[PDB]
């Protein structure tokens, strides 16, 4: 549903229907952005309620060397997060790898314009951990 | 009601071209009587006597 | 029963015979026809009493209202759309049949022109702009018509056939001097080449007509104003092609005809090709401007709004009391309007 | 009769104002008590209800052939109905005021819409019969507004404004950092740094020269190569540099007008190229 | 049918809601007599006579037009009484030609 809503946000061609869907798309991204910051400041994917890929990751005490070598992708329904504001065509691959290295410190207008203003904080934090 | 009205409207197109010279309302009655079975020859005859009777009366 | 209710609240039908019939009034001079008929029937041994459609006294002026601007009339016969005439069975009780025919035949021939002028309305550029200027007079001519329609519905009625007839006479005399202009206007359809001479020479017949009326005006200056409306809106695309030919360098023309035979030379060994048409001093200004813009758009190195405003400023101070005499002076303000742009365009030629 | 006729002209059939899908909305022939003459002027008013429901299906069919300037053209078509529907409503309050009225008064008030409506009905049928879509929509309405009739030349500029606005969505994204958002290949910049991006002529307005088309190509190609590398090293960006904020403003002003001129457009193709022209010179020294 | 024929009489005369009793009584008599129409049913045969009639008053453009109208008519509704309506109209046609005399003195004789 969230990836479908951004697809309908790209059809802004009668520009009275575009702002009404913007209100919708932005409320829907609230739970989603919670799931971004929980996975790189603790290194555990959390999601027991609602569907946005239900897992908690596989713990390992025989590994240590990135922690996980099997647990699937964290979002495995598209096999890398796509097509939500946040560019995600390297940014979803750079939250992925930052998630690993918090496990090595701790434990064992235009729809493209809002896409690009959020993108540059999110490349800056992945280099910050 | 939809079907009936749409034959009449097509029917009124022919009547004005062919020079019937009858009214809309009267034609609907002519058509209802036919569907219930009437002879056509008798029906024109009656129309004709009534028509002539009206003109003479007014003057 | 509903049929009977309609028949009392609506005036009794006279396009179909199936409604009873009045032609009574208590005055002694209003039953004139019944008296006239009687006379003919006893004097003449050979009298043919017609079958007469009984009208419905002084409702003939409502059919004059519709007929003069508005729709085709299917209550009266029109042999074609350029021939309006009045059926030979219309009687009003307070006149003779013949006497009646004679007032209705004046307005019939005056509605023959507005109805003919309405068939010209097409819902090239010159004709489209002449159409919107004829059509504009028609929506302002119905303002006076819709006034006279509210007079007959008001009780008491007031109007008769001939009493609002000398009220609609300024417009009546305005639609006739339109007829003399238009016969001379379009009557170039059989003539060879439909291209530039039709468009030019209909702007030129407007130009010829404003001298014939303005310089004998000031006793019907009502007809001077009309022919100038038809000219300011007809000259409006034909000046603005000349506005685009300077400030952009090149112009807009139909792809099936020219309206001015302005043509540009694609190879460079001459500037522009000219072919003569139908004012005459203004044409030289077009040649010299296009010569200079045609170099400058291939090699940079080194009007209508204004017309309306010079017309208005004579007017707030056709006839004028800041110009004598009269319409050619407001025009010679326009020859400086092209001129202030024209000399400084040609200024730039020698600069490159 | 008078007020009930107003509902026939906002597209709602009685059985008196019968709708036929051949000859249109028409008054039924010789119905009891209707003057010969009043049926003739009532039929001229029914042609403005015929082209009005031939226009409201054209909105609903293509909102809510395929194209994304087609539906910008539909919000182009809704704007000419705007004064029509106000003049049906100014008849509406007059006929609630008193019930005696002449149909000559509606004849007088709605002739104005009898010369906008035929001249725009040829526009939508010409769109649907050459099967044309895209940026050649902007070309299709523009050269008719060159044509006669002052009402129609102002009108079609208001129709111009809204699909010119969806042309303007293309040129704000194509210059943002690159990336064309057409979902049906609708613009004049061909889809191709990974592969070379060029121009198409099968769509490309004929008042915008071929040599102007490239003035838009090359500035977009130069941000197309950082779409390639990474978007934080951009010569435009949207937090990284203020180059784009200046460009957008020049864009907003040209956009918001119902007529588009090329002289103004070509001066800001200079400025979008000359301030980021030195970025690529400072690329290839250190490369 | 009693109501329909009485309403038929009242409508044509444009008035008389129980004064058209005499005319009515006649109409009930004529209808109660029987006929054998020359050409009985079959849609092709009546359409052919209508076209000839159109040509004869010199209304060609109308003959061509009618034929489309006939196909249309069918499509809108299908009867077994279709023919009776088309033959009825046919007989009840009026010629444009001549004056239809006076009635303003013909009444008196």
SS3 labels along chain C: CHHHHHHHHCCCCCCCCCCCCCCCCCCCCCCHHHHHHHHHHHHCCCCCCCCCEECCCCCCCHHHHHHCCCCCCCCCCEEECCEECCCCCEECCCCCHHHHHHHHHHHHHHHHHHHHHHHCCCCCHHHHHHHHHHHHHHHHHHHHHHHHHHHHHCCCCCCCCCCCCCCCHHHHHHCHHHHHHHHHHCCCCCCCCCCCHHHHHHHHHHHHHHHHHHCCCCCCCHHHHHHHHHHHCCCHHHHHHHHHHHHCCCCCCCCCCCCCCCEECCCCCCCEECCCCCCHHHHHHHHHHHHHHHHHCCCCCCCHHHHHHHHHHHHHCCCCCCCCCCHHHHHCCHHHHHHHHHHHHCCCCCCC
D125: number of Cβ within 10 Å: 11
Asked if residue E33 lies in contact with residue B42, where contact means CB atoms within 8 angstroms, the answer is yes
CA C264 to CA D88: how far, in whole Å?
48
Contact with chain C for residue D108, Cβ under 8 A:
yes
Residue of C91, E86, D176, C325 lying closest to A119 (CA atoms): D176
Interface of D with C in 20-49 (CB under 8 A): 32-33, 35-37, 39-41, 44
Residues from A contacting D (CB-CB < 8 Å) are: 10-16, 87, 90, 109-110, 112-113, 116-117, 119-120, 123
Residue of C18, C37, C53 to mutate when probing chain B, most B C-beta within 10 A: C18
C-alpha–C-alpha distance, residues C125 and B57, integer Å = 59
Query: Are A39 and A99 a contacting pair, CB within 8 Å?
Result: yes
Q: Which of D102, D111, D114 sits opposite C149 (nearest CB)?
A: D102
> C285: which 2 tokens?
């200004």
Q: Provide the resolution (angstroms).
A: 4.3
Strands C90-91 and C53-54: parallel
Cα–Cα nearest to C202, from C128, C279, C130, C123: C130
Treating both helix axes as pointing N-terminal to C-terminal, what angle do C176-185 and C97-119 enclose, rounded to 10 degrees? Answer: 40
Residue that is written with structure tokens 């180059």 in the block: D243
Other CB atoms within 10 Å distance of the CB of residue E100? 11
Distance (Å, rounded) from C-alpha C146 to C-alpha C150?
A: 7
Distance from CA of B56 to the nearest CA of E (A): 5
Comparing C-alpha atoms, which of D223, D5, D231, D228 is closest to residue D106? D5
D173 in A contact zone (CB under 8 Å): yes
Chains B and C form CB pairs within 8 A to the count of 11
Buried/exposed D225-262: b ≥16 CB within 10 Å, e otherwise: ebbeeebeebbbbbebeebbeebbebbeebbeeeebee
Cα–Cα distance, B53 to D243 (Å, whole number)? 93
- Asked if D245 and A126 count as a contact pair (C-beta separation under 8 A), the reply is no
Question: Residues with Cβ < 8 Å from C188, sequence gap 6 or more?
Answer: C194, C197, C198, C201, C202
C138 neighbors C226 (Cβ within 8 angstroms): no
Min distance B58 CA to chain C CA atoms (Å): 6
Q: Is D186 exposed, middle or buried (0-12, 13-18, 19+ CB in 10 A)?
A: buried
Give the determination technique: cryo-EM
Closest of C152, C71, C155 to residue C115, by C-alpha:
C71
Report CA-CA distances (Å) from A105 to B51, C34, C149: 108, 121, 94
Nearest CA in chain C to B58: C20
- Distance, in Å, from the CA atom of C132 to the CA atom of A111, rounded to the nearest integer, reads 46
HSE of D69, CA atoms in CB hemisphere, 13 A: 30
Alpha helices in B1-59 (DSSP H): 2-18, 24-35, 40-58
Q: Which of C53, C56, B45, D119 is nearest to E99 (CA)?
A: C53
Please, what sign has the CA dihedral across residues D121, D124, D130, D134? Answer: positive
The pair of three-digit structure tokens given for residue E7, joined into one six-digit string: 């309403």
Rounded CA-CA distance C250/C247 in Å is 8
State the burial class of residue A74 (Cβ atoms within 10 Å of its Cβ: 0-12, 13-18, 19+): buried
Q: Of C129, C87, C135, C88, which is closest to residue C114 (Cα–Cα)? A: C135
With DSSP H G I counted as helix, E B as strand and the rest as coil, what are the percentages for chain A, rounded to 5?
35, 0, 65
From its phi and psi, is residue D9 left (phi > 0), alpha (psi between -120 and 50) or beta?
alpha
SS (H, E, C) chain D: CCCCCCCCCCCCCCCCEEEECCCEEEECCCCCCCCCCHHHHHHHHHHHHHHHHHHHHHHHCCCCCCCCCHHHHHHHHCCCHHHHHHHHHHHHCHHHHCCCCCCHHHHHHHCCCCCCHHHHHHHHHHHHHCCCCHHHHHHHHHCCCCCCCHHHHHHHHHHHHHHHHHHHHHHHHHHHCCCCCCCCCCCCECCCCCCCCCECCCCCCCCCCHHHHHHHHHHHHHCCHHHHHCCCCCCCCCCCCCHHHHHHHHHHHHHCCCCCCCHHHHHHHHHHHHCCHHHHHHHHCCC
Cα distance between residue C200 and residue D3, in whole Å? 46
Query: Residue D189's beta-bridge partner residues?
Result: D199
Task: Tell me which residue of D124, D37, D119 sits closest to C121, measured CA to CA.
Answer: D119
Cross-chain residue pair B58–C16, CB shorter than 8 Å: no
In contact, A70 and A99? CB cutoff 8 Å: no
Let me know: does A69 contact A61? Beta carbons within 8 Å: no
Distance of CA C206 to the CA centre of its chain: 12
Residues 6 or more apart from C140 whose CB is under 8 A from it? none
Distances, alpha carbon C119 to alpha carbons C110, C139, D152, in Å: 15, 15, 20
Rounded Cα–Cα distance for residues C127 and C234 (Å): 8
Q: Which of B7, B11, B10 is nearest to E88 (CA)?
A: B11
Cβ neighbours of D130 (radius 10 Å): 10
Phi, psi of D199 (to 5 degrees): -130, 145
Orientation angle between helical segments E21-31 and B40-58, nearest 10 degrees = 160
The H-assigned helical ranges of E32-104 are 43-56, 60-76, 82-91
Nearest to D262 by CA among D206, D222, D220: D206
CB neighbours of residue C31 within 10 Å: 15
The structure tokens listed for D186 are 């609708």
CB contact under 8 A, E84 and B38: yes
Q: Return all residues near D198 (Cβ < 8 A) that are at least 6 apart.
A: D189, D190, D192, D217
C287, C185 contact by CB (below 8 A): no
Write the CA distances from C161 to A47, C75, C165, D18, D49, integer angstroms: 91, 17, 7, 37, 36
Residue in C with minimal Cα distance to E103:
C51
C-alpha distance across the termini of chain B, in Å:
39
Q: Which residues have CB under 8 Å from C231's CB, separation 6+? A: C203, C206, C207, C210
Q: Which residues are bridge partners to D18 per DSSP?
A: D26
Tell me the chain B residues in contact with residue C20 when contact means C-beta distances shorter than 8 Å: 58
Q: Is A14 left (phi over 0), alpha (psi -120 to 50) or beta?
A: beta
Measure the CA–CA gap between B29 and B42, rounded to whole angstroms.
14
Cα–Cα distances (Å) from D185 to D52, D179, D191, in that order, read 31, 13, 8
Q: Is E37 exposed, middle or buried (0-12, 13-18, 19+ CB in 10 A)?
A: middle
Chains E, B in contact, 3 or more Cβ pairs below 8 Å: yes
Shortest distance, CA E50 to any CA of chain B (angstroms): 8
Whether chain B lies against chain C with 3 or more Cβ pairs closer than 8 A is: yes
Contact C239, C283 (CB under 8 A): no
Adjacent-strand bridge partners of D19: D25
- Closest Cβ opposite residue C128 in set D35, D102, D149: D149
Q: Collect all residues with Cβ–Cβ distance below 8 Å to C243 and sequence separation of at least 6.
A: C303, C304
Chain C neighbors of E20, CB-CB under 8 A:
none
Residue D95 and residue D7 in contact, taking contact as beta carbons nearer than 8 Å? no
């Amino acid at each position: 549903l969230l990836s479908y809503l951004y697809k309908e946000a790209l059809e802004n061609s009668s520009n009275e229907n575009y702002p009404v869907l913007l209100s919708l798309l932005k409320t829907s991204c609230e739970p989603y952005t919670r799931f971004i910051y929980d996975w790189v400041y603790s290194g555990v994917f959390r999601d027991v309620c609602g569907e946005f890929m239900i897992q908690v990751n596989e713990d390992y005490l025989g590994f240590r060397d990135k922690r996980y070598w099997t647990h699937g992708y964290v979002l495995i329904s598209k096999e890398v997060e796509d097509c939500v504001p946040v560019f995600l065509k390297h940014v979803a691959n750079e939250i992925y790898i930052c998630g690993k290295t918090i496990n090595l410190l701790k434990l064992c207008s235009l729809p493209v314009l809002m896409k690009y203003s959020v993108t540059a904080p999110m490349v800056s934090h992945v280099y910050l951990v | 009601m939809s079907a009936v009205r749409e034959t009449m409207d097509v029917l009124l197109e022919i009547s004005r071209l062919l020079n019937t010279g009858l009214d809309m309302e009267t034609l609907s009655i002519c058509v209802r009587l036919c569907e219930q079975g009437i002879n056509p020859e008798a029906l024109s005859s009656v129309i004709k006597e009534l028509r002539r009777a009206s003109d003479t009366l007014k003057a | 029963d509903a049929r009977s209710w309609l028949e009392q609240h609506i005036v009794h039908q006279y396009w179909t015979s199936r409604a009873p019939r009045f032609s009574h009034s208590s005055h002694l001079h209003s039953n004139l026809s019944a008296i006239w008929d009687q006379h003919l029937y006893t004097t003449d041994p050979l009298y043919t009493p017609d079958d007469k459609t009984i009208v419905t006294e002084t409702q003939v002026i409502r059919e004059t209202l519709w007929l003069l601007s508005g729709v085709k009339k299917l209550l009266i016969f029109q042999l074609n759309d350029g021939k309006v005439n009045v059926r030979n069975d219309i009687i009003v009780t307070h006149m003779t049949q013949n006497c009646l025919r004679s007032v209705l035949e004046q307005i019939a021939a005056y509605g023959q022109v507005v109805f003919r002028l309405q068939k010209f309305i097409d819902e090239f550029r010159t004709y489209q702009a002449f159409m919107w200027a004829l059509y504009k007079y028609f929506i302002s001519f119905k303002e006076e018509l819709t006034e006279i329609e509210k007079c007959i519905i008001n009780k008491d009625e007031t109007v008769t056939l001939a009493i609002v007839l000398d009220k609609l006479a300024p417009r009546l005399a305005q639609l006739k001097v339109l007829h003399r202009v238009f016969s001379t206007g379009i009557a170039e359809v059989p003539p060879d080449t439909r291209n530039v001479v039709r468009a030019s020479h209909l702007l030129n017949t407007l130009y010829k007509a404003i001298l014939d009326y303005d310089n004998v005006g000031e006793a019907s200056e009502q007809t001077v104003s009309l022919l100038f409306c038809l000219w300011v809106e007809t000259v409006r695309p034909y000046l603005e092609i000349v506005d685009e030919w300077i400030v952009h360098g090149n112009l807009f023309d139909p792809a099936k005809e020219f309206i001015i035979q302005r043509n540009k030379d694609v190879p460079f060994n001459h500037r522009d090709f000219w072919y003569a048409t139908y004012l005459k001093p203004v044409l030289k200004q077009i040649i010299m401007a296009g010569k200079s813009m045609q170099l400058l758009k291939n090699l940079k190195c080194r009007l209508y709004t204004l017309f309306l405003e010079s017309v208005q400023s004579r007017l707030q101070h056709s006839e004028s009391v800041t110009c004598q005499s009269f319409e050619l002076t407001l025009r010679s303000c326009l020859y400086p309007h092209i001129g202030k742009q024209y000399l400084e365009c040609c200024g730039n030629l020698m600069y490159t | 009769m008078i007020h009930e006729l107003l509902l026939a002209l906002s597209g709602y059939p009685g059985s008196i104002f019968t709708w036929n899908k051949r000859t249109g909305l028409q008054v039924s022939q010789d119905i009891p008590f209707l003057h010969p003459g009043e049926t003739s002027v009532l039929n001229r008013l029914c042609k403005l209800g015929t082209d009005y429901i031939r226009f409201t299906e054209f909105i609903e069919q293509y909102t809510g052939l395929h194209g994304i300037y087609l539906r910008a053209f539909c919000r182009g078509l809704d704007s000419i109905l705007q004064p029509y529907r106000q003049a049906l409503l100014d008849l509406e309050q007059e006929f609630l005021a008193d019930p005696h009225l002449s149909i000559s008064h509606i004849n007088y008030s709605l002739d104005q819409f009898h010369l906008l409506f035929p001249s725009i009905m040829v526009v939508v049928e010409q769109i649907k019969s050459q099967k044309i879509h895209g940026c050649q929509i902007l070309e299709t309405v523009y050269k008719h507004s060159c044509g006669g009739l002052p009402p129609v030349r102002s009108a079609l500029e208001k129709t111009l404004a809204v699909c010119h606005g969806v042309m303007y969505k293309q040129l704000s994204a194509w210059m943002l950092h690159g990336l064309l958002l057409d979902q049906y290949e609708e613009f004049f910049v061909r889809q191709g740094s990974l592969k070379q991006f060029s121009l198409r002529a099968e769509m490309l307005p004929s008042y915008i020269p071929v040599r102007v088309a490239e003035k838009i190509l090359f500035v977009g190609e130069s941000v197309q190569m950082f779409e390639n590398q990474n978007v934080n090293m951009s010569r435009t960006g949207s937090i990284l540099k203020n180059q784009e904020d200046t460009f957008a403003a020049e864009l907003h002003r040209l956009k918001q007008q119902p007529l588009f001129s090329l002289v103004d457009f070509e001066s800001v193709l200079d400025r979008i190229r000359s301030t980021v022209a030195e970025h690529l010179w400072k690329l290839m020294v250190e490369e | 049918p009693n109501v329909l024929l009485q309403n038929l009489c009242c409508r044509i005369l444009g008035k008389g809601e129980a004064d058209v009793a005499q005319q009515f009584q006649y109409a009930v008599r004529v209808i109660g007599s029987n006929f054998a129409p020359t050409v009985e049913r079959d849609e092709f045969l009546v359409t052919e006579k209508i076209k000839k009639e159109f040509v004869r008053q010199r209304r060609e453009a109308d003959g061509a037009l009618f034929s489309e109208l006939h196909r249309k008519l069918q499509s809108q509704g299908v009867l077994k009484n279709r023919w009776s309506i088309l033959y009825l109209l046919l007989s009840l046609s009026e010629d444009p030609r001549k004056q239809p005399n006076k009635t303003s003195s013909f009444a008196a004789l």
